[PDB]
């Protein structure tokens, strides 16, 4: 599309500039163009892709939650009828959010996942696939909702299976995946006990492996372990 | 307090 | 354009929802549609218009300043040549910012200002005209730069003349106008002494009129007086 | 410290 005429390296450079300027929509567009060049992504480039889209969709999701709460209050008994505007605007934001999720899922399917052979890259992309199906699930209310939830679950499960076989329990990708799959269990799959069990087991297995790490790797792993602990404290 | 997912 | 089919009242309602969701681009698009209905704006609606666009352009300006600083460092002696990307991306953000300023100026010219007869509305729109020319001036480097600066100055000066004749010195619109015209003098017109004089005179005349105000009006006026004081402390 | 203009 619109990035077809720009060099791959220039798209990456501009994605980094967009990140510095907090222009995440631009950053995502540059990284989409880079993916569409057809070459595999490096570790740094995968990070840029994920940062860009997680910030774009994160803003859409926060807006959707504001509007959904307003809409829910409007449907409470005793609430005045204010017309279709709240629903219409929530639907507009929702459709835009779904479009971005579909875009990310499309990049993963064409053709990031199929070309990813190393454990790190494959787990990273499968985690992303689970996340963007999870974001679709947050807004789903219809007849494909169960299939959206199962698509998230299946992607997370494959990522977990690979990560357990091929990566140490302190690996930041493995840890972030487990954090997100635990959130999936808690608030999407209605399985709080599974969420708590996964967070605890992940935390404890990482703790036991910290002794193998350099100071810098220790800092990276413990940062994500603290997120797991934050959720355990909230949930128990 | 909102639960954490994998974010900065 | 795209809002032509939506009711004026629905556009206003959605602008308020967009504000609650911090979706300022949407908020600005809704308020543009409302203006284009051709009816004059109420006090609340003028506030929504200004809030929307000042947040959109404020984000663009902050991004432009980040990129401009990177570009300036790239042109320092000893800096490696990294290609045209930094300039290109700064230009992209700059062109988008200029487009939004031109959009706002177009709404003011067609036909908000000419229909605004009450002092409050006319001063408000002329302040906005000065502000959006000022934002154009922040990025201007060429042969029309002096005319852009004079357009900002002329709009601010007409707003100041009306505000002094028709509004009390504690009026929040008068105070915000004086704050912004003082910033114009300081950093656009290279007139720091005029900026300081205007901020001091505005502060002191407002102080002398506080005794006439209710508690709520006192709070509104003193909030803006503190911004004037913040600048005086920074500049002296 | 950036100077103030008329913002929230
Ligand atoms: C610290 N941190 C973010 C919180 S999990 C990470 O290492 C990280 C970053 C990205 Br992009 C993807 C994944 C997976 C993990
Ligand atoms: C507090 N405050 C913002 C800081 S000047 C204002 O009263 C205000 C708001 C808007 Br919109 C326009 C103008 C003029 C003034
Ligand atoms: Cl809408
Ligand atoms: Cl560009
Ligand atoms: Mg490969
Ligand atoms: Mg390994
Ligand atoms: Mg009139
Ligand atoms: Mg009067």
Residue numbers in the entry:
A (entry chain A), C (entry chain A): -4 to 231
B (entry chain B), D (entry chain B): 175 to 182
Structure paper excerpt:
14-3-3 proteins interact with many phosphorylated proteins, with differing affinities and cellular concentrations. Drugging the hub protein 14-3-3 raises the challenge of selectivity, given that 14-3-3 binds several hundred phosphoprotein partners. Inspired by chemical crosslinking and reversible covalent fragment-based drug discovery, we developed an approach that we term “molecular locks” to rapidly access molecular glue-like tool compounds. These dual-covalent small molecules reversibly react with a nucleophilic amino acid on each of the partner proteins to dynamically crosslink the protein complex.
Locks 5–6 and 9–10 were designed based on previous chemistry campaigns, which identified that halogen-substituted phenyl rings probe a subpocket of 14-3-3 shaped by residues Ser45, Phe119, and Met123, resulting in enhanced stabilization. Halogen-substituted benzamide rings improved stabilization (5, 6, and 10), except for 9. The optimal combination proved to be a 3,5-substitution of the bromine and aldehyde functionalities. The DSF data corroborated the enhanced stabilization observed in the FA data, with molecular locks 5 and 10 eliciting 14-3-3γ melting temperature increases of 4.7 ± 0.2 and 6.0 ± 0.3 °C, respectively. High-resolution X-ray structures (<1.4 Å) were obtained for all molecular locks, except compound 9, in cocrystallization with the ERRγ phosphopeptide and 14-3-3σ (C38N). 14-3-3σ features a cysteine (Cys38) in the binding groove in proximity to 14-3-3 Lys122. The cysteine was mutated into an asparagine (C38N), as present in the other 14-3-3 isoforms, to avoid potential reactivity in the crystal structures. For all other molecular locks, a continuous density was observed for the entire compound, including both the covalent bonds with Lys122 of 14-3-3 and Cys180 of ERRγ. In addition to the dynamic covalent bonds, the compounds also make noncovalent interactions with both 14-3-3 and with ERRγ, responsible for the tripartite molecular complementarity between the molecular lock, ERRγ, and 14-3-3. Molecular locks 5 and 10 proved highly selective for the 14-3-3/ERRγ complex in the client screen.
